[PDB]
Amino acid sequence: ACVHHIKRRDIVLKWELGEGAFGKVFLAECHNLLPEQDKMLVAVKALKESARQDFQREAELLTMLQHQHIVRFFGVCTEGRPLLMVFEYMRHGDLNRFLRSHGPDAKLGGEDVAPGPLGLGQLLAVASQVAAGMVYLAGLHFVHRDLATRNCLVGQGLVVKIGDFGRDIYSTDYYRVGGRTMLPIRWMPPESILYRKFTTESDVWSFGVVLWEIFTYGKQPWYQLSNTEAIDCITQGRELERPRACPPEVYAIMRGCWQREPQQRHSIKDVHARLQALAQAPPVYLDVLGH
Numbered sequence: 001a002c003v004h005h006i007k008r009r010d011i012v013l014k015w016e017l018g019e020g021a022f023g024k025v026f027l028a029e030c031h032n033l034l035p036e037q038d039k040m041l042v043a044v045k046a047l048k049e050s051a052r053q054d055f056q057r058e059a060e061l062l063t064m065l066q067h068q069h070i071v072r073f074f075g076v077c078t079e080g081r082p083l084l085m086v087f088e089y090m091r092h093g094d095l096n097r098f099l100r101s102h103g104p105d106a107k108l109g110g111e112d113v114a115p116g117p118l119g120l121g122q123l124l125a126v127a128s129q130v131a132a133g134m135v136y137l138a139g140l141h142f143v144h145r146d147l148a149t150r151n152c153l154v155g156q157g158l159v160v161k162i163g164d165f166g167r168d169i170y171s172t173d174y175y176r177v178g179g180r181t182m183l184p185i186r187w188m189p190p191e192s193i194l195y196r197k198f199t200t201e202s203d204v205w206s207f208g209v210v211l212w213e214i215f216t217y218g219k220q221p222w223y224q225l226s227n228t229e230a231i232d233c234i235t236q237g238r239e240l241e242r243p244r245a246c247p248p249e250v251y252a253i254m255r256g257c258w259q260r261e262p263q264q265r266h267s268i269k270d271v272h273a274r275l276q277a278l279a280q281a282p283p284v285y286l287d288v289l290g291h
């Protein structure tokens, strides 16, 4: 257990940010966490609570996964109750709400983003960041299982990072099975729905769905269908349409994440190289991509 610890006197709760079942998230002030910083803002998760052993293995797993496009984990506070998990605070909240509030369906302030809906270059910078995080996880042979824009965070400078939360204003993004167990069906490949198989290969299908969410400005995949109607066409080989804001070159990336045969799909190292090239592309080349 190389899990970093924090003393409860070093954490000062300000107010709530989010809530769930196995938690509730607070914005807090943390002292002596990072040198030269003195005091910094963090997101503190107070746990529900015998799942202390479940919490410990989860803490050990979050310590292991530390990268530039993975939501930073600082440590736990085991001294007293409730048990606390400390993470980095992300000014813009989750990627889904960020997309919806910077979309054509938004009513209105410009420090990190220009007026109006996010541009093609911004949307691609957002997609390449999520891909870079998936390259690291696939590299470590880690299978996410819940890759969606509602599980990504956006920080100062439009830095996008991957996490895994519990949500609850995103209940329609899940299909309730055994009165407790939930599935993000709309984000799952046929092998996961039909055979209950989840691998690195299935994560690229999910990233492909994330790519479609980015370009639809956070709209739900298969929104026009119910959960069973969604399972039918996912298992029957039906693909999501090209988003209005999506150029054909990018739709070619999504389609390649959606090759039914898992082994016939492009690697995440590939998808990332194709997205990084488009994000780092000059405006002249990108203006040609936009029609």
Ligand SMILES: Cc1ncc(NC(=O)Nc2ccccn2)c(-c2ccccc2)n1
Residues within 6 Å of the ligand: 017, 018, 019, 025, 043, 045, 071, 087, 088, 089, 090, 091, 092, 093, 094, 153, 163, 165, 166, 167
């Ligand atoms: C309004 C708003 N700002 C920031 C947020 N979170 C973070 O800055 N970090 C973080 C880290 C780990 C787990 C959850 N959140 C959240 C939020 C709250 C609950 C769950 C999802 C996101 N919401």
